[PDB]
Amino acid sequence: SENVSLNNISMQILRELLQYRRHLTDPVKNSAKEEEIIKTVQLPRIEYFIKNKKPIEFILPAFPTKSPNINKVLGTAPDMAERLSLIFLNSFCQRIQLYYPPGARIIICSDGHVFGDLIHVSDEVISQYHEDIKQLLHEVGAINLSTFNLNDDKELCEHSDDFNLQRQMLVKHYARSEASIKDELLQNNNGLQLYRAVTRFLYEDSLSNNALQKDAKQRAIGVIQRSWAWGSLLDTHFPKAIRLSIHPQPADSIKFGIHMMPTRDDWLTPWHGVAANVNGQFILMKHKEVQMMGGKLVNIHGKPSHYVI
Numbered sequence: 001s002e003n004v005s006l007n008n009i010s011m012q013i014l015r016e017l018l019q020y021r022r023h024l025t026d027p028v029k030n031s032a033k034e035e036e037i038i039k040t041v042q043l044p045r046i047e048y049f050i051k052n053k054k055p056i057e058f059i060l061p062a063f064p065t066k067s068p069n070i071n072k073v074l075g076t077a078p079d080m081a082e083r084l085s086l087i088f089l090n091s092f093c094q095r096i097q098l099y100y101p102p103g104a105r106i107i108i109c110s111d112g113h114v115f116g117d118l119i120h121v122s123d124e125v126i127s128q129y130h131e132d133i134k135q136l137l138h139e140v141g142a143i144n145l146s147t148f149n150l151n152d153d154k155e156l157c158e159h160s161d162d163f164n165l166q167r168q169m170l171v172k173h174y175a176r177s178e179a180s181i182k183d184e185l186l187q188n189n190n191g192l193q194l195y196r197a198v199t200r201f202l203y204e205d206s207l208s209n210n211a212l213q214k215d216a217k218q219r220a221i222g223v224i225q226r227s228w229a230w231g232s233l234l235d236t237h238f239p240k241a242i243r244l245s246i247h248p249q250p251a252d253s254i255k256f257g258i259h260m261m262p263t264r265d266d267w268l269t270p271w272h273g274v275a276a277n278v279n280g281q282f283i284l285m286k287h288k289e290v291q292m293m294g295g296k297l298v299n300i301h302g303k304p305s306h307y308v309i
């Protein structure tokens with residue numbers, strides 16, 4: 001039949017995707033069966049666009065702000081690493097054109113203002129990081145990529161520059177109770193490793209250790225609650241869209257975790273890391289770990305984009 005043509009296009013996309021899967025890396029897992037599970041998960045969602053002959057669309061919540069711990073990151077400004085990440089994502093969507101001419105698009109949805117209170121990063125700073133990452137797209141000429149923001153939603157606070165209200169509304173209409181968040185996370189090793197990892201980044205950013213520890217553990221459920229709010233917001237705004245995630249996801253999840261640079265850390269993101277030229281291949285590493293490597297910093301446009309080794 002003709003499903004043979006359609007099934008062949010959808011699989012090539014899924015296979016390209018899988019090459020950049022972000023996952024909890026654990027050898028006891030039969031990777032083969034994980035993928036066989038994901039085939040069933042995403043192939044139908046992909047074939048939706050193909051049957052319609054519509055360009056395939058992805059949503060990805062990412063790039064909310066640069067981590068304020070200069071132990072991890074070079075600067076508040078977006079660094080080369082997102083540049084390299086942004087440039088990767090856009091070319092991913094051009095490749096698909098080589099099979100499937102409508103192509104693909106990715107709506108990067110910024111989550112910077114949603115949890116901005118709990119990160120101790122100014123709403124002023126956040127807004128500039130956003131404006132800059134829009135800036136990068138045009139410098140990059142990354143057409144297949146566009147941006148989605150809290151301000152865009154009609155249902156969100158009218159106009160802008162009342163984030164505290166915007167956050168309240170978002171929590172009201174789309175969030176869940178931190179009590180229900182803590183309960184849901186415990187069930188899985190999946191949910192457990194989110195909790196732990198979210199807290200480790202919150203603690204690492206904030207440098208009384210027992211105080212700061214219980215503190216990061218509470219902010220974690222907070223930040224996670226805000227993120228799933230933004231998640232249900234997009235979950236309704238772009239329902240049939242394929243759902244990319246910046247975090248490792250289970251093979252059963254609707255969300256498909258994805259990487260954008262080489263790194264041995266599953267959870268590192270461009271905002272938490274600097275870019276390193278090591279063996280003539282860029283890698284996402286932490287600013288501290290790379291200085292102990294005797295890396296030399298290189299500056300472009302009067303700002304420090306990356307280190308070299």
Ligand SMILES: N[C@@H](Cc1ccc(O)cc1)C(=O)O
Nearest residue numbers: 064065066067068119201269
């Ligand atoms: N979303 C980040 C958490 C984070 C985001 C922005 C920050 O400035 C700091 C922490 C993560 O993957 O862990």
